[PDB]
Paper text:
Different [name] variants are expressed by different EAEC strains, where they are required for the bacterium's adherence to small and large intestinal mucosa. As with Afa/Dr polyadhesins, [name] consist of two secreted protein subunits, a [name] (A) and a putative minor subunit (B). In the fiber, subunits are linked together by donor strand complementation (DSC) with an N-terminal Gd donor strand segment of one subunit inserted into the hydrophobic cleft of a neighboring subunit. In this study, we report X-ray crystallographic and NMR studies of monomeric, donor-strand-complemented major and minor subunits of [name]/I from the German outbreak strain and [name]/II from EAEC strain 042 and provide an atomic resolution model for the structure of the entire fimbriae.
The DSC-monomers of the major subunits (AggAdsA and AafAdsA) have a classical Ig-like fold that consists of two β sheets packed against each other in a β sandwich. Instead, it has additional strands C and D, which form the edge of β sheet 2 (CDC1C2FGdA2) in this subunit. Both strand F and the donor strand (Gd) at the other edge of sheet 2 are longer in AggAdsA than in AafAdsA. The donor strand of AggAdsA inserts seven classical donor residues in to the acceptor cleft, which is two more than AafAdsA and other structurally characterized subunits from FGL CU systems. In addition, AggAdsA contains an α helix in the loop between B and C1 strands, which is absent in AafAdsA. These features give AggAdsA a more elongated shape than AafAdsA. To examine if fibronectin is a common receptor for [name], we studied AggAdsA-fibronectin interactions using surface plasmon resonance (SPR). The experiment revealed specific binding with a dissociation constant of 16±2 µM. We focused the mutagenesis on surface patches comprising proximal pairs of lysines (including Lys51 and Lys109, Lys55 and Lys103, and Lys73 and Lys76) and the three closely positioned lysines Lys73, Lys76, and Lys78. All the double mutants exhibited significant decreases in fibronectin binding and, despite the absence of the cooperatively expected for a polymeric [name] fiber, the affinity for the triple mutant of monomeric AggAdsA dropped below the detection limit of the experiment. The pocket is particularly well pronounced in [name]/I. Three closely positioned lysines (73, 76 and 78), mutations of which practically abolished the binding, are located in the loop between the C2 and Ć strands at the bottom of the subunit.
Author numbering: 7 to 156
């Protein structure tokens, strides 16, 4: 029903960098949150979050060794959805004035997923879809989540 004349921002935050010991058994949480401007929410903006893995799953990737990685399936807030009823892990949410954030998280369980020392990064992509004067448009950005082991 509405279009904007300044493109919607895509505003993502993530968990700050974490450090853990190789022998820790505690679950490690990582989360991301996406929003946009109040005017874009009024206009009907839809925000997105996705990873770089198969089916847009989130990948915690060792800096040195290509094959060392964990592909993680996200959990999302109750107002968000997965693409195609969950056949893909890409996430979207139509924001509203009473519900302004898309929130999602993953977890590494050291008990089932072995912890190797070193640096890990996890790339997340976020976007916002809206209409401007030329019709459908989107802006996207990226942020990298970090984990240091031992």
């Amino acid at each position: 029903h509405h279009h904007v004349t300044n493109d919607c921002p895509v505003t993502i935050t993530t968990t700050p960098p974490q450090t853990v010991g190789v022998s820790s058994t505690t679950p490690i949480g990582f989360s991301a949150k996406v929003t946009t401007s109040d005017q874009c929410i009024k206009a009907g903006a839809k925000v997105w979050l996705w990873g770089t893995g198969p089916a847009n799953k989130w990948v915690l990737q060792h800096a040195k060794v290509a094959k060392q990685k964990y592909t993680l399936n996200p959990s999302i807030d109750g107002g968000a959805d997965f693409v195609n009823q969950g056949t893909d892990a890409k996430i979207y949410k139509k924001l509203t004035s009473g519900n302004k954030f898309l929130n999602a998280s993953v977890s590494v369980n050291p008990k089932t997923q072995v912890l190797i020392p070193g640096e890990y990064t996890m790339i997340l992509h976020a976007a916002v879809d809206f209409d401007n004067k030329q019709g459908g448009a989107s802006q996207q950005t990226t942020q990298t989540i970090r984990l240091t082991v031992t």
